[PDB]
Scaffold this active site. Sequence first.
Site, mmCIF file in Angstrom:
data_model
loop_
_atom_site.group_PDB
_atom_site.id
_atom_site.type_symbol
_atom_site.label_atom_id
_atom_site.label_comp_id
_atom_site.label_asym_id
_atom_site.label_seq_id
_atom_site.Cartn_x
_atom_site.Cartn_y
_atom_site.Cartn_z
ATOM 1 N N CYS A 44 0.772 -1.175 0.016
ATOM 2 C CA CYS A 44 0.049 -0.032 -0.023
ATOM 3 C C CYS A 44 0.869 1.387 -0.063
ATOM 4 O O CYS A 44 0.508 2.128 -0.821
ATOM 5 C CB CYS A 44 -0.899 0.021 1.085
ATOM 6 S SG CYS A 44 -2.241 -1.146 1.395
ATOM 7 N N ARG A 119 -7.665 -3.958 -3.813
ATOM 8 C CA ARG A 119 -6.703 -3.073 -4.562
ATOM 9 C C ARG A 119 -7.487 -2.798 -5.612
ATOM 10 O O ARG A 119 -7.624 -3.205 -6.758
ATOM 11 C CB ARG A 119 -5.465 -3.741 -4.864
ATOM 12 C CG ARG A 119 -4.435 -3.144 -4.553
ATOM 13 C CD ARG A 119 -3.144 -3.984 -4.406
ATOM 14 N NE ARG A 119 -2.663 -4.982 -3.277
ATOM 15 C CZ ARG A 119 -2.154 -3.961 -2.283
ATOM 16 N NH1 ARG A 119 -1.923 -2.744 -2.389
ATOM 17 N NH2 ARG A 119 -1.808 -4.874 -1.328
#
Lengths: 213, 213, 213, 213, 213
Positions: A44, A119
């Site tokens: 991330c 995602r």
Amino acid sequence: VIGEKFPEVEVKTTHGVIKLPDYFAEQGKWFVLFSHPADFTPVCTTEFYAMQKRVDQFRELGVEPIGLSVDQVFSHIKWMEWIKENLGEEITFPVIADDRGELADKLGMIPSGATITARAVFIVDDKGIIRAIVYYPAEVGRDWDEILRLVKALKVSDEKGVALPHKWPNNELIGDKAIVPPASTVDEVKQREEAKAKGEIECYDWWFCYKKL
Amino acid sequence: VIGEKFPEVEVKTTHGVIKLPDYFAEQGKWFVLFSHPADFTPVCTTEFYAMQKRVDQFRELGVEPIGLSVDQVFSHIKWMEWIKENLGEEITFPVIADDRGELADKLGMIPSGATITARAVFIVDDKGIIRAIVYYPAEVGRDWDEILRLVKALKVSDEKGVALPHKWPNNELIGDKAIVPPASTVDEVKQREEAKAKGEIECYDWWFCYKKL
Amino acid sequence: VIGEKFPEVEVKTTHGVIKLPDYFAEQGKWFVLFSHPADFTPVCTTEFYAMQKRVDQFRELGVEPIGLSVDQVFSHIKWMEWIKENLGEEITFPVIADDRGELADKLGMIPSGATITARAVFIVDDKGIIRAIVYYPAEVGRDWDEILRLVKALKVSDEKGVALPHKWPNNELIGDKAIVPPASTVDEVKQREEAKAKGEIECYDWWFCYKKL
Amino acid sequence: VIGEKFPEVEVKTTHGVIKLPDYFAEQGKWFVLFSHPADFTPVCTTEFYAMQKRVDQFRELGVEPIGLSVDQVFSHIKWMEWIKENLGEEITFPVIADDRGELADKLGMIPSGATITARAVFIVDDKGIIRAIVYYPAEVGRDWDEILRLVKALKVSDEKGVALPHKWPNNELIGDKAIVPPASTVDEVKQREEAKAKGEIECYDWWFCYKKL
Amino acid sequence: VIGEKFPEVEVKTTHGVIKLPDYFAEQGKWFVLFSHPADFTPVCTTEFYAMQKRVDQFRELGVEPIGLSVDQVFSHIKWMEWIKENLGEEITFPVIADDRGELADKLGMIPSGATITARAVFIVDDKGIIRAIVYYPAEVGRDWDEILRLVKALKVSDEKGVALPHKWPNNELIGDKAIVPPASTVDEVKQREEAKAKGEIECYDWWFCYKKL
């Protein structure tokens, strides 16, 4: 699902309480929404860093980036302070504190089995229309350069009423040339030959035609 | 089923988006709709070729031909380019890209077991009335000359208020003579004898009467 | 609808009461069921005459003709006796007296607006399966030759595993040659390639193959 | 069932499309409707012949005869041509082509087990009231002389407000004398004796009284 | 309705209480059930008298007469005693006292508008089956001869397997000859042909055959 308008929905963000999609749409601007599992995580972070690095490429296209997770604003900001200090990049685009996943739910950002976002990337224009959608797993970071290619294609596609070949602007076959929407009627076919002879377009066939911008 | 009006229904075709049956009806014209399994197939191709060959016979009767399958316009056209190049006949009548079989369903063009059209023909006049119907199998090509005989009979039948014998205009018994609708009332019977004596019609019997056009 | 089974049914004919398809499928014969509006009408007579002069052509094939109107048996045989007395041909195939249209209705031989059969043809193999259907209006007599052709076509397709071209055995592109069912996998195409070299099939394309019988 | 009005119902007949019972009623005329199994049958023919023979007796009473079966008009007429040629009696009264038995159903003309009419007679006056009803079997022809006696009785009965004895006008007991509707009240009884004395009527008893016409 | 079974039923008569059809069908006799409106009325008396002078004609045949009104038994026998005392004939056949019309109603002998039987005749064989029905109005007495004729006709048809012509045994075309049931298959017609040559049947047509008994 594509082509739908974006849900009219209000968000708490790092840069303020804002209204979606009205806030970007009313400004002529488009936006790329993307979701990440949790503040303070490795992959991330690599992605956020990378977006910041490219934020002016997106922005320069009139395309505003914005992130989102189920975390709360205070850990959002704190993690961003982190990236400014350990990577040395001030994060400069808004992040959504998606409370309980109100919005994530609505957008199918959640994978099977889960209570946190994945995602995901959504591209949404200045008329609120969702233009494209991506879902990668937790375990793999995105590529913002692929997400960047795509948007440019879209921008061009709308501005010029053209399609873009596989891998544009580096298509192995016709390079950075744009594709003529294949003709669908016998009369439209005469417009293809009329155009080839006389040299406006080039054509592998009547359906397969292309030109420069 | 016969005699019903034709469903008011819009189609994507090779020659354009058109409205059925309004497009033909508003022009005084009739039309013979016929369905084929799949673009790029043997029997089907022999039929298309043959229709093109006869297109001016139909058209000359004010009778517009039009084909249809579940394929998409691009493979329609492509296959027609094929017939122009390998058989050397430019296909000149419209073809329907029947999406998912919207229309085919409505018309019972589909056989038991199947998701593709068969070998169907529909004749539909300038008041939208379906006049006649044919369903042959995949495995057997039609005969456009039989489909042609039929239409002429119909045209004549309406223009002159007459019936046509088996195999007209080459009926073994009364040749190309047209049949007088058999009389159904005792008083109508006197009109038959009144006509035989005095020589307008000829009569095997009071129900069986015929004359020249 | 094609491909479907002929409903089991017990019918009153001029030759007896029989069970369909059983009576024919039992013996291993096909049959052509056809309908006419009414005894002692003109076109209807022209087609009964024509069928009788065709009966042995069909009968040779294991195809049995059988007709049907909503008339009572006595009326039927009287009509057959008129054809005998008046035209030289003795009708020699059964005809169904179909009380209140009970069969005409299951097969939906009834045209929009009325309580009588029109002009229908159903062709059925020795397994009770429905191979082809034809709905002609009253004002236009059929052509027993086209049906003769169709049945011939069918019997061939079944025995040799082939398909048939427009208007076979007088097709404009290949006369009385048989068509090979289109190759539909990459493996079947090579199967074709290897068959062309080796003169077992001629080809316009890998999907357009024919042969002599 | 008796006394009911006759269903307002339209019929295709040999003499035309007519409206029942309006067509006869509006003309002052009564009618005897009667049904037969099937055109071209033995018993049925003997009856039609016989009616024609008596048609002017019925008609002369203002009583119009009309037949009916489930057959179609063309076999009606054809069978009537037959009677004109083999018995030499032109049939001159209308016949109903009762389609599918629309009307027969409504009138309970059909016997248990059957899809064809039986041997039924209905007498219906100029106010549309059904006056009397008869159902004989297939296997036995009617007697039009009994059906004739009855109507005369009825005509007289209405014209004179009288009853008719068993077998009138040949009653063994009081011959062709008409019966006085038996008195139902003590005061009406005084009118019977008042009439016997003074000689207008004759009386076996106060309930049983009769006179000449 | 004809062809149907006589409902099983237990009735109070002037001769006993009996079960119908059992009482007659048990013995192997037929019966004629007939209804009259009311004891001590005129037409009703004329027909009881007439039946009694006919009783042995019927009784000879295995046909039993039996009547019915909605009157109580005592009333009935009083009426029979009036006929004895006043006209010389002793009534000698049973009569049903039908409380509140409970039977009159199942047979629907009740005319539109009232609570009493009219003038009905039901003729029933030794198997409880209903062979013929006749509904005459009160104002017109029956003709026991026509019923005598009908029953004679019936018994014959059953024993010889035949049908009967209009007004048999006094038919205008063949007197007291029997009619042969119409041939209804192509095979039965030849059966007729071969019977005519060989003088076993005379013929107006293959469908119109008769013979002496």
